[PDB]
């Protein structure tokens, strides 16, 4: 891909005491046109990993196909594919990251930003980031695009350091994620009110919620805004 066409916007994610949470809207934008509504950008792999992708929707679907093929190939000749030899989040990440860096170095990158979030077999919370440049980093809060500028400042006030992770509950993290989605719908032109939210908890497993909407919006004060300065009526 040399320039993206149909693109998805920000993807936010953060850790908490017993797992991780990720979320992203369901919008596919043809530039300035909100062309496709209801476009799932959260790909659940197994019962312990979720991949959130932003960028070219075609490359996102290519990565979906790659993940499905990776699951199928790991199932081959593996009697423990549902157990000790299942696909871990770190495996899926490392694979995607190798792919992204290779595609960058071949001057034909996957125009995407990917966030892999899940729980390892030993209960550890995995949350890492990659992009079309192949740059990888891991932080208690990860966002792409406008989220990286707006979602992270809100989510980092809950977990500014690793030591804050054991103190955060699932309700706190989910409320923060919903607030960040609302703020993005406020201040992102390429955003949507409908989104999806996944919770990978080391005890309850994968909880995937679709068709969510941004609620509790403050718009009443818009009635008191009249004119761009000196106008009174």
């Amino acid at each position: 891909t040399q320039q993206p066409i149909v693109t998805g916007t920000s993807v936010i994610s953060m850790k908490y005491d017993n797992g991780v949470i990720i979320a992203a809207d369901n919008l596919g934008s043809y530039g300035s046109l909100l062309r496709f509504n209801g476009v799932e950008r959260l790909i659940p792999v197994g019962d312990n990993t979720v991949v959130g992708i932003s960028g070219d929707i075609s490359d996102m679907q290519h990565i979906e196909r790659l993940l499905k093929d990776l699951v199928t190939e790991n199932a081959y000749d593996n009697p423990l594919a549902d157990a000790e030899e299942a696909l871990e989040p770190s495996y899926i990440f490392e694979y995607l990251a190798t792919v992204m860096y290779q595609r960058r170095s071949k001057m034909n990158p996957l125009w995407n930003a990917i966030i892999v979030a899940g729980v390892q077999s030993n209960g550890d919370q995995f949350l890492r980031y990659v992009n079309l440049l192949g740059v990888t980093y891991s932080s208690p809060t990860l966002a792409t695009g406008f989220g990286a500028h707006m979602a992270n400042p809100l989510l980092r006030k809950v977990v500014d350091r690793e030591s804050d992770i054991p103190k955060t509950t699932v309700q706190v993290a989910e409320e923060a994620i919903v607030n960040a989605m609302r703020v993005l719908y406020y201040r992102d032109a390429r955003s949507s009110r409908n989104f999806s939210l996944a919770i990978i908890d080391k005890n309850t497993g994968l909880t995937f919620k679709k068709n969510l909407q941004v609620e509790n919006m403050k718009w009443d004060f818009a009635k008191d805004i009249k004119g761009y300065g000196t106008q009174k009526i």
Partner: protein, 141 residues
């Protein structure tokens, strides 16, 4: 004349490829494996000869899986069966990548059959030493 069994793909005066029949003899020397088609699917079964108690039970899996819906069990030379299963998995992956839908069971059958028939076409390749019972459930049952 003589020597019609020394080279693969060479037809005998009767019209037979003796190397193929020798491979069949090699197949008959293997353990027993069966397949039964029920009303909504298929069931495969295989015997694993326990050469010694040193073998780990429930390990040394003999039945292989292709895609997520095809099962294959082969009687004869186990390495040849694994090679054929790998080739079939490649064919199924190609079929899915190109047509989205999972490969139909008859299409997979024809792919494996053309692969084997090609392996019985040249004197530089040895015919497969396995008989394979496979199948599964597709959109046509």
């Amino acid at each position: 004349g003589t020597g019609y069994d020394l080279s693969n793909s060479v037809f005998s005066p009767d019209g037979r490829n003796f190397q193929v029949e020798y491979a069949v003899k090699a197949v008959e020397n293997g353990t027993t494996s069966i397949g039964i088609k029920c009303n909504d699917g298929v069931v495969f079964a295989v015997e694993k000869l326990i050469t010694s108690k040193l073998l780990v039970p429930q390990k040394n899996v003999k039945i292989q899986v292709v895609d997520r819906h095809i099962g294959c069990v082969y009687s004869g030379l186990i390495p040849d069966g694994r090679h054929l299963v790998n080739r079939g998995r490649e064919e199924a992956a190609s079929f899915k990548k190109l047509y989205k839908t999972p490969i139909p069971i008859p299409a997979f059958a024809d792919r494996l059959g053309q692969y084997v028939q090609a392996h019985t076409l040249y004197n530089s390749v040895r015919p497969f030493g396995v008989s394979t019972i496979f199948g599964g459930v597709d959109k046509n049952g």
